[PDB]
Design a protein around this ligand. Structure first.
Ligand SMILES: Nc1ncnc2c1ncn2[C@@H]1O[C@H](COP(=O)(O)OP(=O)(O)OP(=O)(O)OP(=O)(O)OP(=O)(O)OC[C@H]2O[C@@H](n3cnc4c(N)ncnc43)[C@H](O)[C@@H]2O)[C@@H](O)[C@H]1O
Length: 214
């Protein structure tokens, strides 16, 4: 019902987020989507993240805490949710604690650092639809084209390999301690942890998730 997806950038969280959404009918709350949408439409609550997402840095904890707080207040609460990209720092995890939001599962998408850069530099997306591709690991039917609309695919500005390394460094510094954060909470019986082998093909990763959830 209420689960958190953890993992290094490019571990595959967003890909498996689409599957968990359809299989179990819980909404996907992705801070990356909401910010990129707020920037695209110039929405006051998020448009400020433009220059710093393109730089590969993290958004101020307060700005995403409020956007998540506003997004969770929209949905019907027992529909559940599927957090993808949040929490990303210890203060963001403490915000959910203070706000009385307990989770049922934490799913860790473990992937070696040696795959991270290649997964992200090879990523292409269809921005209007959110569809995600990889040149090698999950390619479109036609090169550079979107499978549904035929429009020329795009590469996100922060998917430049240099910005990726800035992101991978910042992930190890600010976001990786959430693995020990929520593993301690699982050991306290406040949630249920689960590590997932993110190196498998997407077919098997989606199978491993099915066995963990239901
Ligand atoms: N909470 C927050 N607090 C502060 N700032 C925030 C924030 N949230 C967002 N931001 C801001 O904006 C940016 C972060 O961007 P964000 O939108 O949060 O991350 P992505 O950029 O969405 O990165 P994940 O880190 O989400 O990658 P992914 O795990 O979803 O895997 P994916 O399926 O795409 O896969 C990677 C590529 O994977 C390929 N692939 C997928 N699965 C496999 C597989 N199984 N085998 C081989 N290749 C695979 C995928 O198809 C694709 O090609 C933040 O860094 C900051 O700038």
């Amino acid at each position: 019902m209420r689960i958190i997806l953890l993992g290094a950038p490019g571990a595959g969280k967003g890909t498996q987020a689409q599957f968990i959404m359809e299989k179990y009918g819980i909404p996907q709350i992705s801070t990356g989507d909401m910010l990129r949408a707020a920037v695209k439409s110039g929405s006051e609550l998020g448009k400020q993240a433009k220059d710093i997402m393109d730089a590969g840095k993290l958004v101020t904890d307060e700005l995403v805490i409020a956007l998540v707080r506003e997004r969770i207040c929209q949905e019907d609460s027992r529909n559940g949710f599927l957090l993808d990209g949040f929490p990303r720092t210890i203060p963001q995890a403490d915000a959910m604690k203070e706000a009385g939001i307990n989770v049922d599962y934490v799913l860790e998408f473990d992937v070696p650092d040696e795959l991270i850069v290649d997964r992200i530099v090879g990523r292409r997306v269809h921005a209007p639809s959110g569809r995600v591709y990889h040149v090698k690991f999950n390619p479109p039917k036609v090169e550079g084209k979107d499978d549904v609309t035929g429009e020329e695919l795009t590469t996100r500005k922060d998917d430049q390999e240099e910005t990726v390394r800035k992101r991978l460094v910042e992930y190890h510094q600010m976001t990786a301690p959430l693995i020990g954060y929520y593993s301690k909470e699982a050991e306290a019986g406040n949630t249920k942890y689960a590590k997932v082998d993110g190196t498998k093909p997407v077919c098997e990763v989606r199978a491993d998730l099915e066995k963990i959830l239901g």
